[PDB]
Amino acid sequence: RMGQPPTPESLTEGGQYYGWSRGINLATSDTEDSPENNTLPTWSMAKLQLPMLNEDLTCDTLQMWEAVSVKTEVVGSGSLLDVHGFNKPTDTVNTKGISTPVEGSQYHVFAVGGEPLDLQGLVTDARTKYKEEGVVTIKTITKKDMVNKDQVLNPISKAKLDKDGMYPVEIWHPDPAKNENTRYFGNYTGGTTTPPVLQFTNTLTTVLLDENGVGPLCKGEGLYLSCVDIMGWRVTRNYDVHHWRGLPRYFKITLRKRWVKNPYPMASLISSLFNNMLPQVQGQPMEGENTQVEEVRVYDG
Amino acid sequence: RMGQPPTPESLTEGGQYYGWSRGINLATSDTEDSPENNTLPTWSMAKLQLPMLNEDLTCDTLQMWEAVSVKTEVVGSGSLLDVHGFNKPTDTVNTKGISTPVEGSQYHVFAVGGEPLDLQGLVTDARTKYKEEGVVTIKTITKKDMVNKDQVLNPISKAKLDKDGMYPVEIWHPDPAKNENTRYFGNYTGGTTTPPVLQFTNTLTTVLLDENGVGPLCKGEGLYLSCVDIMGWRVTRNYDVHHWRGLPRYFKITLRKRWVKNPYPMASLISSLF
Amino acid sequence: DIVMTQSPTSMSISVGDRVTMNCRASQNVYSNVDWYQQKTGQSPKLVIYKASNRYTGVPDRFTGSGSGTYFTLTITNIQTEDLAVYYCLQSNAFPFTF
Amino acid sequence: DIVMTQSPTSMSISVGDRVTMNCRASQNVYSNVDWYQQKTGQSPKLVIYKASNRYTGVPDRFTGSGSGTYFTLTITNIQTEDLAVYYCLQSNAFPFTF
Amino acid sequence: DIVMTQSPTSMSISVGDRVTMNCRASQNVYSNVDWYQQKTGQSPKLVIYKASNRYTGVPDRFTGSGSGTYFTLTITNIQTEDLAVYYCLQSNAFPFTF
Amino acid sequence: LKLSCSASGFTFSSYGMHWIRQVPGKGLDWVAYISSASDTFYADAVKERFTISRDNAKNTLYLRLNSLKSEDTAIYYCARTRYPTDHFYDWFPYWGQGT
Amino acid sequence: LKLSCSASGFTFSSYGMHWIRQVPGKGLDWVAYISSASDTFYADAVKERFTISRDNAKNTLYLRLNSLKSEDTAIYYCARTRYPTDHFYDWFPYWGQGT
């Protein structure tokens, strides 16, 4: 999910740039720059809702899922071998040869966790005026504009990858928080004509176990997956518009049930359940400076 | 902290090249190079002041901190995918296409230690005239002009990383002193159009232990972190003024306490009294 | 907004003569300037697109030149079918101005 | 299918004069246009291939120019052996049209 | 400091004639030379920037040429509005000299 | 208060279409623009009042007029760009009939 | 002893501004330069005496005069470069009024 949304199902009205961004148009001055939401590649995410497990209140011990390992794979590289088509040709003087295939800055990140990816805001030029609706920008989270410290690192510009297809990759990067329940891997390769490189195999896995052999335990009961795989951009036989390209990523997660100790008192979370279920109301002041409570008496016998 | 300082906060007066070097202006003649203070990318350093541990100044033993391992990561790689904006475009004959991303010479160094990084001076050109105010140069420390031995190793041009954002990286390199309390890692990749390469992960660490299994003992009581992360330069849609980009680096250090022998010799005090 | 100013407000000239009309833009427009011919009672026809090329069907007497802040449209030998108004349009930022 | 339209249906001109015949294609043909000379009773001979070059053996009076939607064939000084029909052909997509 | 020397100290010439004023710099200035016109009572106006281009609004009679140590400014047909002083300025090192 | 501009003979949704209005005396005046990936760009004077839209599969742009309509009057045209790109600046050569 | 040169209509702090003084008889004479990243470059004769500065958000350069002012007299101009770069050599075409 990067740029064109999947909704215009027809291959003529949406042109079916599905899987591609719409078109990168540059800026007209240093201060005027609007990235046009359907251009920006964004984070893909999903949540699998696992069932509830057993418990043992005699020992205050619980059971919860635990992602033990993962096999990932970016599917569809051979697709980049389609060298016909109406892209910029290699021999441009006569418009002959080969349609220049997908090349350029690539970005492969994935993340498997027991709770949504915690990410950070960090941008290039901070005068950039992102559309204030339909995309989640640093202005959307902290309700003020961007500053210069959002150009290097601002410990205030944090967020959770909660929705989907809305957090542009160019703004929100996986954040190394203090105590984390998520394993994220990633790699970047800049340039303008860097040849894309990819690898498949259905043999090698990834271990998600911690230093203590604990792995991502699933908060709530949901297992969260996240990814972005930008493979480059293509050039049209026109003004060199530069639709991005991205490929789907396949996850195979291997989980098991682990016994954990419930670290909270039962009365505390009972009270919390009652406070969350009940409405939060107003009413007449029964506490403070204008208490309407007149007297209170406490007897014993 | 590479060039443009963080201080002028407005995005119009400073243009906010915060995180970017200011501009690059080549020399006009061979003998006259005087680059700038806000053009040179410099070292970043910080000192965490850890608490005081023990009061066993009657037995030789004494305990102090010890960095056991580090988890580092340059955060902000994906931000280099901003290919709108006013940089030199991919296709220049019509001025259309893609505002070229950040490329060029890149330089990643970091260092975790118990005392400030010991640096060594080595310059490409010993005739460059760095401004003597606001930046530390081989002249600022040797008090004389630069010698031709400063284009290669000169055992005199040595310094430490006292300040921050003051020691440029075109001059001061991590020095392999014979007895060292600091672990520094680094890699450099030259070129004029080299594509950047980076790696996220929160999985594996670096072990700072020595061959004897000691690791940086925080003398004084401080832990010194140093870093430089140059990703390349962006070329503007004008006179092709490049200026560097740098990304922040996140450190996570695992410290434990260790019993050592007393480094505070009372003889020094009871001799300064004489 | 960019303001396009044209030096000749009105030029009176016979057939066979030469005319040159210039255009100035407040800010820099690199090469994105079109030259439109409007005959009274017709939709404006494109004549010189991108300030350096001739749209198809347009004769060789029409010429567009210049780049940046100063553009020009030139006609060497006028014809009877060249008796129309001429507007220069910047298409380099939003909003477009005529 | 692309339709090729030629502006001069018939040109009557003497020896030593200049002729220019234009061709217009409905859709864009980049530079793939040939110019064929047919003398009555002969197979059509290639004159100007790819709209910008002269086939071997063809004299320097023949000239092909233009690219895109508007092409042209020009003869500066006619000769007696230039008294033939001239067709322009787009060879840029299928089917080719004359 | 670079010293800019101009060969014609004063040129007296009528309207319609040609003038060429040369400039020599002690050290090499690659192509960074501007040509300024000052009418008495006005701020000096830029005429020929970077020694090879004409600033916008400046007519085609003005021409700047040369590179390195020897530059030149040429006017083919003088006009009444060209009766002003002309300075050449190197902008290639500090300090700039006129 | 709602215009309509029918187009035929091409793929409607692959091109960007401008609106240009001409009052008889002060010349032409650009109004709005909507590209293939529908994103509206307006003139400075008419920002909040007009709304340009396009209904794909029906091939007509709708310049919903000012909804106030007080001091805006001219001949309203349509224009289609030359090429089917997501490039905003494409020198529309195909003007409408006028209304 | 302190000049002032107001400018308007652009972003003041993105451009580099020169000072050029002209005595009526010996022609023009460059004096100083301050660029976007404020860094002062002076002429050889006036090195220690003048100080060129700029106060951003107020849009005026201050050429603080020689503080001695003995033998320097001319018409003082301002000049703004053509492009908003950190390139020092930018052929300032926008001269001031003169004083």
Author numbering:
A (entry chain D): 40 to 340
B (entry chain C): 40 to 313
C (entry chain L6), D (entry chain L5), E (entry chain L2): 1 to 98
F (entry chain H6), G (entry chain H2): 14 to 112
What's written in the study?
MuPyV and JCPyV are non-enveloped, circular dsDNA viruses with capsids ~45 nm in diameter. Five copies of VP1 intertwine to form each capsomer subunit that also incorporates one copy of VP2/VP3. The β strands (BIDG and CHEF) are connected by flexible loops (BC, DE, EF, and HI) that extend outward from the surface of the capsomer and comprise the majority of the VP1 hypervariable regions. VP1 C-terminal extensions interact to link capsomers together forming the T = 7 d icosahedron.
Each of the remaining sixty capsomers in the icosahedron has six neighboring subunits and is referred to as a hexavalent capsomer. Due to the quasi-equivalent VP1 molecules within the asymmetric unit, the six epitopes may have subtle conformational differences and during the build were not assumed to be identical. Therefore, one Fab was built into the pentavalent site and was subsequently docked into the remaining five sites on the hexavalent capsomer. The resolution and map quality allowed us to identify unambiguously the 8A7H5 epitope and key contact residues for each of the six quasi-equivalent positions. Notably, these epitopes were found to be identical. Notably the 8A7H5 epitopes map directly adjacent to one another in a ring tracing around the contours of the capsomer. The adjacent placement of epitopes resulted in a striking and tightly packed arrangement of bound Fab both within a capsomer (variable domain) and between capsomers (constant domain). Surprisingly, there was no steric clash observed between Fabs bound to neighboring epitopes.
